[PDB]
Amino acid sequence: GKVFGRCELAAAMKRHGLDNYRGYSLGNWVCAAKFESNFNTQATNRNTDGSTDYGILQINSRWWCNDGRTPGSRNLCNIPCSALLSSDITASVNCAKKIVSDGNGMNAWVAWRNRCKGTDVQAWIRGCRL
């Protein structure tokens, strides 16, 4: 398994191009992970619509990844949901980029809305070596 720290995740997200991606500074992305999964790469939350949210960014199996159990599957990231539970974040960042570029920005992440949107998100990467 793996549970990230905030600066460790900030660095990884920056390496893969998330700082300012589609208008969202890096702290938004770290914040989203913090409140979606508490940085736990294997976080999984099974919902009452039959979909499941997977991994550090809690990516949902209706539109974005395939778990073979979800009604209405679009698999827009063309990715097995299993890949989004990996210890390294590449597949989640790849898919997150497509999310943010093809729905409603970071509104896709309800924890981003609830705990990050409009806050001092720079705090999440403050002091991190980037």
Numbering used by the authors: 0 to 129
Article sentences:
While the r.m.s.d. of D-HEWLEC from the H-HEWL structure is only 0.17 Å, H-HEWLEC shows an r.m.s.d. of 0.56 Å. Additionally, H-HEWLEC was found to have an r.m.s.d of 0.55 Å when compared with D-HEWLEC. The main differences between H-HEWLEC and the two other HEWL variants are observed in the Thr47–Gly49 and Lys97–Gly104 regions, both of which are at the protein surface and engage in crystal contacts. While this loop is stabilized by an Asp101 N(H)–Ile98 O hydrogen bond in monoclinic, tetragonal and orthorhombic H-HEWL, in H-HEWLEC this interaction is replaced by a Gly102 N(H)–Ile98 O hydrogen bond. Additionally, an unusual Gly104 N(H)–Gly102 O hydrogen bond further stabilizes the Lys97–Gly104 loop of H-HEWLEC. Interestingly, the refined occupancies of both Glu7 and Lys97–Gly104 in conformation B are similar (51% and 46%, respectively). These observations indicate that the displacement of the Lys97–Gly104 loop associated with the Asn103 peptide flip is linked to the disruption of the Asp101 Oδ2–Glu7 Oɛ2 hydrogen bond and the shift of the Glu7 side chain to conformation B. In the case of H-HEWLEC, where there is a greater displacement of the Lys97–Gly104 loop and where the Asp101 Oδ2–Glu7 Oɛ2 hydrogen bond is completely disrupted, the Glu7 side chain is found to fully occupy conformation B. Additionally, displacement of the water-molecule arrangements can be observed in the active site and binding cleft of the enzyme. It is also interesting to note the absence of a nitrate ion in the H-HEWLEC binding cleft which is present in the other triclinic HEWL variants.
